[PDB]
Amino acid sequence: EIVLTQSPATLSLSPGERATLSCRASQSVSSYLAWYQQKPGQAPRLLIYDASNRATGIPARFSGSGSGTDFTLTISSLEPEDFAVYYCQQRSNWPPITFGQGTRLEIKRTVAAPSVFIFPPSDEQLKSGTASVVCLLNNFYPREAKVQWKVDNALQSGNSQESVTEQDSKDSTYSLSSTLTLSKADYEKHKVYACEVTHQGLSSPVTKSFNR
């Protein structure tokens, strides 16, 4: 088993920039190193084979170097095309065949604050003996944020789920939904309901809240 390491995880870049991608082996894999492109909801595709070789149909913006433990992926000028996920893989020592974990290429943009929205549970859910509390994080950059739930000032762990959008193709934004799950009974017992938003581009953190 070769461990492959990809650095960074995330690359945040503009179009036209040079792109440089890294892959470290755990022992020498010699020259046996591949690179793979995966655009979203598609499959993998081969870029580089054996460090240094272009695959068919693969444009010349795409490049690689290295030997032993040390590998590079080169893109010369970013097409927007190229903002994707990139994997490395060894054929030196297998099985198992191994992959890198991925680098993702993000569009880099100006820092954007969220956009914060709170949703009380509906009416109609209330009956199913449902209750969902919903907090919205609108169109923000970069991707790291933090939600905190609070119920009558008790903060909530383990009771929550969150999702994130893909990068906005016009905005280059991210959005997030947080779901607070909760008993009807619990719901009723409590008064104050509160989503607390912590982000890079806020002076301070934002709190959206409601009284049941």
Binding site: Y32, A34, Y36, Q42, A43, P44, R45, L46, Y49, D50, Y87, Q89, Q90, R91, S92, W94, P95, P96, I97, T98, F99, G100, Q101, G102, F117, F119, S122, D123, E124, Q125, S128, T130, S132, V134, L136, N138, Q161, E162, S163, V164, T165, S175, L176, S177, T179
Partner: protein, 208 residues
């Protein structure tokens, strides 16, 4: 003209069986050797198995062995995955790949999705979420996937349809949102159109 098409996936119960297929066109299937790779949700690549030339030689990843078998009908050009004893974690898109002429994955297919659940087929409930934001809450459905529309597709703009969560339940939940002029709003009607096909479930929800 190299094509690969996977078939065979499914919802499948923990403990059971599932066969996958990989139809090759375009090349010497029979000269190649073949793999399967797998892609859990939110997650990276994971090599599963390899079959030779010849059928003679078969390697398996550790997490799979004794459960999975790799095989091959050369002469209907087809690659096979037999999955016994399915667990929860075997949930993944399953890709078939062509070995080059190696350990190199030359050509991949588009994949086929395998979902491993004791959970019962279900439609969603569709709750309302009332510079303005609005949307719909799509609770407690199984399985994937689901579609959202706003105003029959006439609203596109300021739309966020969020990826689904799994549920302790084993049901899915989700959100679609939209931002809008507070202006509008008196006055413009908003309806989220929800399609959940594996249940034959359609819901139209006015939010106001």
């Amino acid at each position: 003209q190299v094509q690969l098409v996977e078939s065979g996936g499914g919802v499948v119960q923990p403990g059971r069986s599932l066969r996958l297929s990989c139809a090759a066109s375009g090349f010497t299937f029979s000269s190649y050797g073949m793999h399967w790779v797998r892609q859990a949700p939110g997650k990276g690549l994971e090599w599963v198995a390899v079959i030779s030339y010849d059928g003679s030689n078969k390697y398996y990843a550790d997490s799979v062995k004794g459960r999975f078998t790799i095989s091959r009908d050369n002469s209907k050009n087809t690659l096979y995955l037999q999955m016994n004893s399915l667990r929860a974690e075997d949930t993944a898109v399953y890709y078939c790949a062509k070995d080059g002429k190696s350990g190199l994955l030359d050509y991949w297919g588009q994949g086929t999705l395998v979902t491993v659940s004791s959970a019962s087929f279900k439609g969603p409930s569709v709750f309302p979420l009332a510079t303005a934001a609005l949307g719909c809450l799509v609770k407690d459905y199984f399985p994937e996937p689901v579609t959202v529309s706003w105003n029959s597709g006439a609203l596109t703009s300021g739309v966020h349809t969020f990826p689904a969560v799994l549920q302790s339940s084993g049901l899915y939940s989700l959100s679609s949102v939209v931002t809008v002029p507070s202006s509008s709003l008196g006055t413009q009607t908003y309806i989220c159109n929800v399609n959940h096909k594996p249940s034959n479930t359609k819901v139209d929800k006015k939010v106001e």
